[PDB]
């Protein structure tokens, strides 16, 4: 299916006069594969997936060098934004960056991506064309104009279509086994007798990978739109996910109600009821 590489960067300024904390997290198909943290004992890029251990010392050395330059770029930029927004260095400020590429099933480039936030709000993004910028407010326009004048988008376009694509191809090849795997959900229903015979029935789905799942409840072949309570998908911690959907209305007449689990890892959608 579709593939992606993404680097999520964060620089947090530190009130107590100290230098910002810089973190860079790399993802290959929404799974963490590398990580840099300026707060580490020895700050360097580290493998965060087993298949990444095969990259030689020259790789980690070069990536750490890049991260160090990024640390400085975020320090300068952090100071500039303070001036644009008439802020105090006595408070903590946040600069975030998201960049990478999407590929199709054939591993061909779909689109490049480059976005920035300041204080968790959109600041500036590179447009899909990878030639023009969209500033989010009056202060972000200062950056847009500065970046047009420096031919900045040309630098980003080259990486996003060149190196980003070439490196993701290598990672998809080296991570072959690890990346292709899916864990199918294991479902079951629980019943909790609530008040005036009105027992609540909860459909659990556990141990699934990836996170996308669909859970539904049906009253004699008719899907339940209202009443159905649905928790947000949560990580189990082992690398898998959990989710549950619950229906209230059923009294001492539970077998009319049926649950359905839809997941790409399933050899066929599951169906269950019970006590």
């Amino acid at each position: 299916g579709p593939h992606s590489m993404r680097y999520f960067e964060t620089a947090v300024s530190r009130p107590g006069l100290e230098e910002p904390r810089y973190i860079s997290v790399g993802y290959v198909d929404n799974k963490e594969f590398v990580r840099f943290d300026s707060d580490a004992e020895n700050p360097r890029y580290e493998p965060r997936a087993p298949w990444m251990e095969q990259e030689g010392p020259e790789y980690w050395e070069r990536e750490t060098q890049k991260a160090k330059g990024q640390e400085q770029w975020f320090r300068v930029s952090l100071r500039n934004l303070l001036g644009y927004y008439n802020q105090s260095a006595g408070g903590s400020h946040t600069l975030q960056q998201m960049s990478g590429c999407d590929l199709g099933s054939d591993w061909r480039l779909l689109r490049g991506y480059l976005q920035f936030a300041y204080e968790g709000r959109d600041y500036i993004a590179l447009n899909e064309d990878l030639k023009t910028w969209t500033a989010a407010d009056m202060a972000a326009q200062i950056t847009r104009r500065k970046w047009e004048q420096s031919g900045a988008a040309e630098h980003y376009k080259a990486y996003l279509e060149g190196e980003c694509v070439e490196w993701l191809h290598r990672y998809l090849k080296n991570g072959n086994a690890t990346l292709l795997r899916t864990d199918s959900p294991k479902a079951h229903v629980t019943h909790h007798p609530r008040s005036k015979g009105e027992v609540t029935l909860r459909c659990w789905a556990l141990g699934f990978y990836p996170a996308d799942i669909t859970l539904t409840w049906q009253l004699n072949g008719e899907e339940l739109t209202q009443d159905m309570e649905l928790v947000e998908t949560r990580p189990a911690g082992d690398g898998t996910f959990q989710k549950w959907a619950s229906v209230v209305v059923p009294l001492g007449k539970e077998q009319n109600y049926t649950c359905r689990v839809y997941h790409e890892g399933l050899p066929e959608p599951l169906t269950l009821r019970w006590e």
């Binding site: 990580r35 975030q96 204080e119 928790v231 990580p235 911690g237």
Partner: protein, 98 residues
């Protein structure tokens, strides 16, 4: 200032006496500075494992706090979160049914 969303749940279905893992999943927060505590009967659990900080596509931060626990019918478990966006700390209690 984005308000943290909390979920307190176990790794595996809870069977009294069986060793498990208790998770505190904190999401949708900004700025990244947060304080998370896990409590066994209103008391701090030493040795709480914390995932490294990450952020979502919407720029918000998330963290998974976890602990080794053995469920019992008397022992209660909670997660207390302190964030700049909240006037008071938010406490979510573990419920084996959720």
């Amino acid at each position: 200032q984005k308000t943290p969303q909390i979920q307190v749940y176990s790794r595996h279905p809870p069977e009294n006496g069986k060793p498990n893992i208790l998770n505190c999943y904190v999401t949708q927060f900004h700025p990244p500075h947060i304080e998370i505590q896990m409590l066994k009967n209103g008391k701090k659990i030493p040795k709480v494992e914390m995932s490294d900080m990450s952020f979502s596509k919407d720029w918000s931060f998330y963290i998974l706090a976890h602990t080794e626990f053995t469920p019992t019918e008397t022992d209660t478990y909670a997660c207390r979160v302190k964030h700049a966006s909240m006037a008071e700390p938010k406490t979510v209690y573990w419920d084996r049914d959720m």
